[PDB]
Design a protein around this ligand. Structure first.
Ligand SMILES: *[C@@H]1O[C@H](CO)[C@@H](O[C@@H]2O[C@H](CO)[C@@H](O[C@@H]3O[C@H](CO)[C@@H](O)[C@H](O[C@H]4O[C@H](CO)[C@@H](O)[C@H](O)[C@@H]4O[C@H]4O[C@H](CO)[C@@H](O)[C@H](O)[C@@H]4O)[C@@H]3O)[C@H](O)[C@H]2NC(C)=O)[C@H](O)[C@H]1NC(C)=O
Ligand SMILES: *[C@@H]1O[C@H](CO)[C@@H](O[C@@H]2O[C@H](CO)[C@@H](O[C@@H]3O[C@H](CO[C@H]4O[C@H](CO)[C@@H](O)[C@H](O)[C@@H]4O)[C@@H](O)[C@H](O)[C@@H]3O)[C@H](O)[C@H]2NC(C)=O)[C@H](O)[C@H]1NC(C)=O
Ligand SMILES: *[C@@H]1O[C@H](CO[C@@H]2O[C@@H](C)[C@@H](O)[C@@H](O)[C@@H]2O)[C@@H](O[C@@H]2O[C@H](CO)[C@@H](O)[C@H](O)[C@H]2NC(C)=O)[C@H](O)[C@H]1NC(C)=O
Ligand SMILES: *[C@@H]1O[C@H](CO)[C@@H](O[C@@H]2O[C@H](CO)[C@@H](O)[C@H](O)[C@H]2NC(C)=O)[C@H](O)[C@H]1NC(C)=O
Ligand SMILES: *[C@@H]1O[C@H](CO)[C@@H](O[C@@H]2O[C@H](CO)[C@@H](O)[C@H](O)[C@H]2NC(C)=O)[C@H](O)[C@H]1NC(C)=O
Ligand SMILES: *[C@@H]1O[C@H](CO)[C@@H](O[C@@H]2O[C@H](CO)[C@@H](O)[C@H](O)[C@H]2NC(C)=O)[C@H](O)[C@H]1NC(C)=O
Ligand SMILES: *[C@@H]1O[C@H](CO)[C@@H](O[C@@H]2O[C@H](CO)[C@@H](O)[C@H](O)[C@H]2NC(C)=O)[C@H](O)[C@H]1NC(C)=O
Ligand SMILES: *[C@@H]1O[C@H](CO)[C@@H](O[C@@H]2O[C@H](CO)[C@@H](O)[C@H](O)[C@H]2NC(C)=O)[C@H](O)[C@H]1NC(C)=O
Ligand SMILES: *[C@@H]1O[C@H](CO)[C@@H](O[C@@H]2O[C@H](CO)[C@@H](O)[C@H](O)[C@H]2NC(C)=O)[C@H](O)[C@H]1NC(C)=O
Ligand SMILES: *[C@@H]1O[C@H](CO)[C@@H](O[C@@H]2O[C@H](CO)[C@@H](O)[C@H](O)[C@H]2NC(C)=O)[C@H](O)[C@H]1NC(C)=O
Ligand SMILES: *[C@@H]1O[C@H](CO)[C@@H](O[C@@H]2O[C@H](CO)[C@@H](O)[C@H](O)[C@H]2NC(C)=O)[C@H](O)[C@H]1NC(C)=O
Ligand SMILES: *[C@@H]1O[C@H](CO)[C@@H](O[C@@H]2O[C@H](CO)[C@@H](O)[C@H](O)[C@H]2NC(C)=O)[C@H](O)[C@H]1NC(C)=O
Ligand SMILES: *[C@@H]1O[C@H](CO)[C@@H](O[C@@H]2O[C@H](CO)[C@@H](O)[C@H](O)[C@H]2NC(C)=O)[C@H](O)[C@H]1NC(C)=O
Ligand SMILES: *[C@@H]1O[C@H](CO)[C@@H](O[C@@H]2O[C@H](CO)[C@@H](O)[C@H](O)[C@H]2NC(C)=O)[C@H](O)[C@H]1NC(C)=O
Ligand SMILES: *[C@@H]1O[C@H](CO)[C@@H](O[C@@H]2O[C@H](CO)[C@@H](O)[C@H](O)[C@H]2NC(C)=O)[C@H](O)[C@H]1NC(C)=O
Ligand code: NAG
Ligand code: NAG
Ligand code: NAG
Ligand code: NAG
Ligand code: NAG
Ligand code: NAG
Ligand code: NAG
Ligand code: NAG
Ligand code: NAG
Ligand code: NAG
Ligand code: NAG
Lengths: 143, 191, 191, 142, 191, 143
């Protein structure tokens, strides 16, 4: 049983899906990557927000629908992986403050990957900066 | 801030409160009090306290199902909680009441390898954001976590601004929701 | 029509009936009668009716298991049906006979947030094709699903070629296998 | 876990499809099956292959399919189709599928399911954009 | 001695005895007397024999939960085994003996499609790797396994130098972890 | 739902994990095929042994941890499917031995695949070397 949920609107996060900031619209390349990539949390949050939006629009207070559709709308082992990291005192992700890399010249946008957290506080930029550099090195190959 | 002269770093602080209606949102208030909010105007208040409220060993589950006065969503959440305990064998620990549609449960707690480990582990996995302050040591120990509190009393509550410390996060409930019956000790030959 | 001058649209319909000696096949007859078929000799018949066939509230499940005259596959499908149903709390709303290896079951079905929503949800997930005609709510109704019929009867029958208004379709049962223990309320302290 | 059963290019015998045609697909179509997850076809192919293997390589119980359901099929694809059903979104009941046949050389794309709504197969012009997208993806041959 | 000129085919054999500490392993040393080890100095012994040790048909397993003395890992493996038996429908064809933390669980094995078939299927699947010798069935009669022996027994034992016939392999137990509560016959309406 | 666990930095097998070899260490590159492919048996063993490594170092008897992490670490359905092969007379894998094509000059190694088992013994090259030929053609296809 794998994630199986489409996204429709390049999905763009609205004002109510993120705190004190403007709409963050992403290119369709990131969504196409979300279609394939499994071990990604931001794609799961996109699926959850899309599911919530479709729930308000196409349906009219039980919690049974998500109780069935959780395995479709969450990868369900990213939570387990992050929990396993957290119990081992390893840095993990609590699904907030996702970071990306947007191109100022062209407006291109990366796939947002999670900002790791450790010791109950946000993990500094220098500690995982090599991961950002690896993402940039991957993205120059996208040319 | 500019990285490699080509790209720049940014953030996305997601708003989980938009997901209120779709599924429960688990948040914290302090070390003792943690909360689950189902839609609005209803939710559970899971607290760790030394003062007992039930103080009897019965648990009117079948009678509560027959009368059917409780709320279905909260009962589903509590069923997910109880089933999610990795190893529950001492039935004397749990004590509940649902008189007149009420909902309240109490998991009694008292070297190691006891039911309190499973109860507190499922408690952490429920209140999964910012609940690290419950333990005396929040690192280097998961299989034998112990807390100074004697009881875990679950209660239904109204919807005030309880959330503090950690912010609302439905990740913990959906994490529990997959591991409902992954480890249950048999009690009957015929299931 | 031809797309881009060279690419033509050609379709294929799967002959789903040829899975008949491997796994159950669910089909419809009309808005009431929906036929599940294990093999080419026996199967279950789900019928929504205002007339009852079991007039008593007992259900001899344990004695049926002890005697063990029923067919294993039919009981497996009925177990999947009863386990898959969400929020089952009123035990009185089901009856069964299992008299001498029989299979007959009757879910009493006589609004939102009731057992009828779960019964009809399991029914439409099992028999997917007939959900258009068996359900009176139309489309877009999920929580408050409720039909006019007063009982959901399950019997055992043979293969008399009763599949009409829908082809054989194992998608409902195969999809419903993963829903077996997704949502069940705790019934007692010791699991 | 995820589906893992491998297909024994797959050609579907006249027994297991209507209109009695071989419908032999190319190697690329079967190659897409292993990677892609959220596509309704390559799900029934696994079921029919498992059907044939169970019939021929084993001398009436539904315990085998109970064991092998999650290994064979993506159950959550069926759940997505049901979620589309309840929401009045067009969905796929795994009945009829369509592919773009290239008549010059006979190569065909992996077929996509024909969506349904209100108890009727959906109008082909409604999703013609998806057909054009499949054409454009197939033009990227090399 | 190269494939396509510039490729050596170098073989890799992997040692699964290294995983003994944090997760169970399974092996064989006889036609009977298969074995599971939790870690060192602790395991279960699947003695598949022709003579009984527990004539008492009373399992008395809830009382074992009352007096918490059994090892939790061994009881977890017992629950994984019992919950993984397909279509188990006879409580009489099973016996137990819990006394001072002891674990001694017997499965009676005295036509095609009985309880013994499910017991032997789960036994092969737990001890996959060296269970081929144990059971007389061939290759194409998986629906029901016939075996000359008449009893299966699961007993706690300290870990001696077992694993003589088959290499250690944790694959069966991890396979059974997904098998829990997937194929169970309903016995109570409320579960 | 879906496997998600990720490797530790170095990950490659050692004498603690092989039978005879000493530090048969992969290059820790061109191993992300495991993240893409789900039918591979060697990948599940890599992740399982990496998890055992962190289990020894990070935490300190109970088998709760593997019970929680079995779905996050390994595609259990691949075990189910190879066991289905075990029911039939078809060659199967019992997760013991693997094979890989090691290039001579550059030294690059393909992702290992299981050596199939039949009749209680490993398969001969005939009836199975066609897979080796296809794999070698894949290596020639790399550029
Ligand atoms: C997956 O499947 C494959 C194929 O079915 C399995 O591969 C075979 O596995 C068996 C068991 O692991 C293995 O048999 C061994 O061969 C070894 C070769 O070195 C032997 O050493 C080993 O033990 C013998 O030798 C020991 C000393 O090193 C003795 O102490 C031991 O008692 C054995 O000695 C034999 O001979 C003496 C002579 O006096 C006699 O007294 C003993 O009783 C005994 O007869 C085993 O014999 C096969 O070699 C494997 N085949 C191959 C090609 O590897 C694999 O195990 C399965 N894997 C899993 C994890 O399931
Ligand atoms: C699985 O079970 C084991 C026993 O319960 C657990 O303990 C492990 O034991 C192994 C034994 O090999 C340790 O591995 C290494 O052992 C060698 C000793 O051999 C050396 O000496 C000879 C003679 O010179 C030489 O020929 C060899 O090359 C070696 O040099 C040590 O040298 C190594 O340092 C290493 O200890 C495991 O390390 C040990 N594991 C630990 C630390 O617990 C084992 O734990 C269980 N599985 C695991 C690894 O979790
Ligand atoms: C298994 O239990 C039976 C029944 O005992 C009852 O159920 C138990 C689970 C526990 O709750 C007991 O307190 C209950 O009384 C035992 O049967 C008794 O056996 C003794 C010894 O032979 C005999 O004197 C009594 O008369 C029996 N009582 C009844 C009601 O049958 C049985 O001994 C237990 N077997 C064991 C521990 O192996
Ligand atoms: C993820 O973890 C971080 C770190 O603990 C949390 O950040 C805190 O959030 C609260 C609530 O908004 C703030 O009052 C604190 O100031 C934050 N701390 C820091 C160090 O920034 C964050 O809330 C967590 N997110 C979730 C969804 O649980
Ligand atoms: C609960 O979630 C709903 C959305 O599902 C929130 O509703 C929105 O609230 C904002 C507040 O600025 C309005 O502008 C939107 O128009 C509302 N949309 C809908 C569909 O109602 C609601 O605010 C949330 N309430 C909480 C805090 O639980
Ligand atoms: C929780 O369980 C503990 C034991 O684990 C109970 O403590 C005992 O309670 C009994 C009954 O009142 C007394 O006779 C004992 O003296 C108590 N022992 C101790 C050490 O205090 C405790 O009462 C239970 N609490 C509940 C159910 O609220
Ligand atoms: C938990 O739910 C119960 C049942 O709905 C609530 O109890 C009722 O509360 C309302 C509001 O005060 C009264 O009108 C009813 O008469 C109460 N009766 C019964 C029999 O429970 C209870 O208030 C809820 N818990 C909390 C903390 O609000
Ligand atoms: C499903 O029923 C069909 C007939 O509708 C069966 O098709 C026959 O299968 C046998 C082998 O069992 C072949 O020899 C025949 O040629 C097939 N056709 C006919 C007309 O009999 C089919 O076998 C049944 N089940 C399965 C699982 O394949
Ligand atoms: C099925 O359900 C109906 C409706 O609840 C049952 O009939 C009612 O039972 C209640 C409870 O005793 C009575 O107050 C009503 O007067 C009954 N209605 C009628 C029309 O008699 C019915 O007994 C249940 N069982 C069966 C077999 O139908
Ligand atoms: C089966 O009984 C139901 C329930 O009575 C019938 O549906 C309607 O029920 C409402 C009350 O819920 C009555 O006001 C209507 O008069 C009933 N309609 C009728 C009698 O046509 C339903 O029609 C009955 N169905 C059959 C096939 O007899
Ligand atoms: C449903 O199952 C029952 C129980 O197996 C079948 O009833 C048996 O039918 C056979 C064949 O006619 C008779 O010889 C037996 O005497 C019946 N036994 C009992 C206990 O009634 C029944 O035929 C099956 N089919 C239907 C349509 O009910
Ligand atoms: C999938 O849904 C379609 C559309 O409702 C079904 O197509 C009908 O199938 C019946 C079967 O008896 C035919 O009589 C109709 O002519 C079909 N309609 C059209 C417009 O072609 C189809 O049967 C369903 N398939 C499954 C497997 O459930
Ligand atoms: C089982 O293996 C463990 C792990 O190697 C051994 O644990 C050691 O136990 C001794 C006492 O016997 C302690 O002094 C050591 O500190 C332990 N080692 C570690 C690394 O924690 C244990 O001895 C082994 N038991 C048997 C019976 O072989
Ligand atoms: C295991 O099952 C066999 C077959 O049911 C049991 O054998 C029966 O034992 C009872 C009690 O002694 C006798 O009355 C029956 O006549 C026996 N039947 C036969 C044909 O042997 C056996 O007792 C059960 N297990 C045990 C404890 O031996
Ligand atoms: C693949 O081939 C290369 C080169 O033959 C192997 O690399 C050697 O590994 C041994 C291990 O002792 C070293 O001593 C050599 O120095 C290495 N040589 C080079 C050039 O790398 C590599 O080990 C082989 N594949 C494996 C086993 O991973
Ligand atoms: C990146 O910067 C551009 C500058 O115009 C802005 O429009 C864009 O929203 C930013 N990022 C994303 C992900 O949209
Ligand atoms: C870590 O982040 C804080 C944020 O306030 C900053 O002051 C500090 O210099 C950072 N440290 C390093 C080593 O980057
Ligand atoms: C946590 O907050 C609640 C709010 O009602 C308060 O009653 C309680 O004393 C607090 N606990 C601690 C340990 O500060
Ligand atoms: C709860 O949500 C409902 C949604 O209709 C809204 O009408 C109601 O005012 C909300 N209650 C509170 C106390 O905000
Ligand atoms: C459905 O068909 C059965 C065939 O026996 C018949 O008894 C029943 O009345 C039919 N129902 C409708 C609504 O046509
Ligand atoms: C079902 O198919 C089997 C195939 O062996 C055949 O023997 C049997 O007669 C068929 N049953 C009926 C009722 O036609
Ligand atoms: C495509 O069309 C050709 C036309 O000759 C036909 O032979 C072939 O079978 C078709 N392929 C499929 C897969 O339908
Ligand atoms: C589909 O919609 C049409 C009107 O657009 C309506 O006549 C028809 O009954 C609907 N089908 C269903 C199954 O509700
Ligand atoms: C769409 O459906 C209509 C009937 O509603 C059918 O006649 C028509 O052929 C379909 N569209 C096209 C472009 O053919
Ligand atoms: C192996 O089986 C024999 C009978 O074949 C039995 O006597 C012997 O005790 C068994 N070995 C062990 C170690 O239990
Ligand atoms: C199969 O046997 C041949 C000799 O007949 C041998 O050369 C070959 O390596 C064998 N295959 C294996 C390694 O199983």
């Amino acid at each position: 049983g794998t994630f199986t949920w489409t996204l429709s609107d390049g999905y763009c996060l609205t004002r109510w899906m993120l705190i004190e900031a403007e709409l963050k619209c992403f290119g369709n390349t990131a969504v196409a990557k979300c279609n394939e990539k499994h071990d990604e949390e931001f794609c799961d949050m996109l699926r959850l927000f899309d599911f919530n939006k479709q729930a308000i629009q196409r349906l009219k207070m039980s919690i049974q629908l998500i109780n069935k559709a959780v395995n479709a709308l969450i990868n369900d082992q990213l939570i387990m992986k992050n929990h396993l990291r957290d119990i081992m005192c390893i840095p993990y992700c609590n699904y907030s403050k996702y970071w990306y890399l947007n191109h100022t010249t062209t407006g291109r946008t990366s796939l947002p990957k999670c900002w790791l957290v450790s010791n109950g506080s946000y993990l500094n930029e220098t500690h995982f900066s090599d991961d950002i550099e690896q993402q940039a090195d991957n993205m120059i190959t996208e040319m | 801030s500019l990285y490699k002269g080509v790209y720049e770093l940014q953030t996305l602080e997601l708003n989980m409160e938009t997901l209120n209606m779709t599924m429960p949102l688990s948040c914290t208030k302090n070390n003792s009090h943690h909360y689950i909010m189902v839609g609005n105007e209803t939710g559970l208040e899971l607290t760790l306290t030394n003062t007992s409220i039930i103080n009897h060993k019965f648990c009117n589950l079948s009678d509560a199902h027959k009368k059917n006065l409780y709320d279905h969503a909260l009962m589903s959440i509590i069923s997910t909680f109880h089933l999610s305990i990795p190893n529950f064998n001492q039935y004397e620990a749990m004590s509940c009441d649902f008189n007149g549609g009420k909902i309240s449960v109490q998991y009694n707690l008292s070297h190691c390898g006891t039911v309190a480990n499973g109860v507190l582990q499922t408690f952490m996995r429920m209140a999964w954001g910012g609940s690290y302050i419950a333990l005396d040591s929040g690192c280097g120990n998961w299989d034998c976590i112990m807390t100074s509190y004697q009881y875990l009393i679950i209660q239904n509550t109204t919807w005030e601004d309880h959330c503090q410390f950690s912010r609302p996060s439905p990740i913990g409930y959906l994490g529990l929701l997959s591991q409902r019956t992954r480890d249950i000790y048999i009690s009957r030959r015929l299931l």
